[PDB]
Amino acid sequence: STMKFCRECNNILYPKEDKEQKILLYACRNCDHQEVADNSCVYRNEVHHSVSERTQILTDVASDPTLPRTKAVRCSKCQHREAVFFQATARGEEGMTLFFVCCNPNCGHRWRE
Amino acid sequence: PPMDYAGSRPRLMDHDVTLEEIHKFFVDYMISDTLGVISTAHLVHADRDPEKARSQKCLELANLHSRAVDFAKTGAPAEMPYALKPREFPDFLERFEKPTYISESVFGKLYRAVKSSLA
């Protein structure tokens, strides 16, 4: 995913490998010029999920799923059953611990397992 | 049948103790230390509501008391709810400032008998 123009004729160069040279080289078919490569890099692409361009807004691809909700747990500050539970790591602890967030709009209370 | 004895999940750190988190835990022990009020609330609810130790409120209070006892072992706060406060105390207590209500349970009868014997 990289390209450069040789100074001799200002044309694109294609990478190639030589067994005897054992070094990356760039030469073009337009003119006869071989130049030494830099950093030994022939491809560098950041992985992205922007494949369905101009299509993720109409059809809901569900890129960010919604957190599950449960009604078995009962809140402490208020007597509301609906709550949001998820797993996340602590500040310094290891593993996944279950958390809870109250769904009452007037409560705004969160507690651990 | 007895209640479940399974405790909370232990919390394990990724690094050794630097003598600071222990101080944080020691200071935070005072905060949210509701060990002494759960028993009083359970006694008040048992004296007020008939058929005590049968409703779900008593089970919740017992679970909270067990968690509070386990707080000294594992860092799991009791999280005492606000709506569970009794806001009323029977005769056989030293909370003179708090409102006092006449109890008609077995404890009330025993306290009345003791008062009559003393007088």
Added chain:
Amino acid sequence: AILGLEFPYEILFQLNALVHAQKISLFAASDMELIKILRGMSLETALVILKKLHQQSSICYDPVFFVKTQMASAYKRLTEQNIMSCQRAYVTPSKIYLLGPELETANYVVKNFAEHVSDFMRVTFVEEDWSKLPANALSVNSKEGYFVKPSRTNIYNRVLSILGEGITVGPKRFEFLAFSASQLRGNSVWMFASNEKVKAEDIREWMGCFRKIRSISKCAARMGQLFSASRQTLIVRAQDVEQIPDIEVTTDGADYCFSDGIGKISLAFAKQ
């Protein structure tokens, strides 16, 4: 720095306890004449007159006139009934109160460190009325943003600073060793004054290695569990110890263990 001499630590601690008590004011005991008189005398007579002054029913205004008008065993006590003189300190948000060398039952940690009897001090964090600290005085809740987040008060930072920096009394600086399970429920903690011979970390590593425990509460519990009153007995090496396997039963998907802390003993060991 005002004294700038070789004044003994015990007399200075007793004087501080007197000042903290409602007996003598700060300036009434900071004069040059009083320290000059109390510098060179008999130690036992000085302790006797100091405790007699402490036992005064009313407030003393002139200590100089009062003191003018007035005029080994620790190891045996520990081996007999575990009797030690432990200093007790009360830390309040406003000031600090020193009760003094009150007699109390000795624990295991002082059996092998009986020489530093005065280095051990009990520190309890109480309110101004010497009562328990209310929950509203530490980490008062406040609603900031979408969720409520507790806000630490200045008393929280003061307690943290006291625990970290330590308490300095005379030519000593006490350090945090550990706290027992009973002391955890009463907001009490042990403090040991560091010395050139044995320091707080030396005692901490002598008790055991606690880096294996990765739980904050479990590590503190294991470090403070070895502070209960006990009677000294003979010493047994680590050559004759059994490893009897235990029994475990798993029913209904629940782990039930019969042997939690049970053990086995012989008749000769019981007789000894």
